[PDB]
Design a binder for this molecule. Structure first.
Ligand SMILES: CC(=O)SCCNC(=O)CCNC(=O)[C@H](O)C(C)(C)COP(=O)(O)OP(=O)(O)OC[C@H]1O[C@@H](n2cnc3c(N)ncnc32)[C@H](O)[C@@H]1OP(=O)(O)O
Length: 162
């Protein structure tokens, strides 16, 4: 079981994996326009960390976008395939992601969660109250009046994915 950052480098291997991830996202986030998922997963600003089983099968992942100078990242999509849920993978994935963000010098994660997903994020340390001022991400991350913007601080010397 590996947690690798997938790069859209135009190779058959990585491309297949990103498509596989994309299909998991659309399956688990049914109300999300599939063409939109495709757009973000394959654009040049987004990266995806996948849960790789047997070094070939994608069973879940997180698609995110780093705003490097600002030191924050938005979690665009997150999911574990249905037949692999409730096995601790979702949590292991987030811990691996936080460890990576810490190494990438990212200070905060932001994500718009679906009412049903809010609980998962709260479990991972995300909160509805923000320690980061609105002015800071405004202009980089879209401000939707109809979703719940959640935030998670990534401490520079806390041991994640331990
Ligand atoms: C921006 C984002 O995309 S928002 C949408 C997030 N994605 C989804 O909702 C997609 C559908 N869901 C999924 O793909 C999965 O259920 C995930 C990623 C939410 C969680 O993955 P799993 O492999 O099942 O996670 P894992 O088993 O490690 O979770 C363990 C803990 O998370 C909690 N948890 C997981 N899913 C949920 C949920 N939907 N609601 C509430 N709590 C949840 C478990 O209750 C558990 O609590 P515990 O450790 O005290 O027992």
């Amino acid at each position: 079981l590996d947690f690798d950052i997938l790069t859209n480098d135009g190779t058959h291997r990585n491309m297949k994996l990103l498509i596989d991830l994309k299909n998991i996202f659309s399956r688990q986030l049914p109300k999300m326009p599939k063409e939109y998922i495709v757009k973000l997963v394959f654009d040049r600003h987004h990266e995806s960390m996948v849960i790789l089983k047997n070094k070939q099968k994608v069973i879940g992942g997180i698609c995110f976008r780093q705003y490097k100078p600002q030191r924050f990242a938005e979690v665009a999509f997150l999911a574990v395939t249905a037949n692999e849920q409730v096995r601790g993978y979702g949590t292991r994935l987030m811990n691996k992601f936080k460890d990576h963000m810490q190494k990438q010098n990212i200070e905060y994660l932001l994500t718009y969660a679906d009412n049903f997903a809010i609980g998962y994020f709260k479990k991972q340390g995300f909160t509805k109250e923000h320690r980061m001022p609105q002015e800071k991400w405004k202009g980089y991350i879209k401000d939707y009046d109809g979703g719940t913007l959640m935030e998670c601080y990534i401490h520079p010397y806390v041991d994640y994915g331990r």
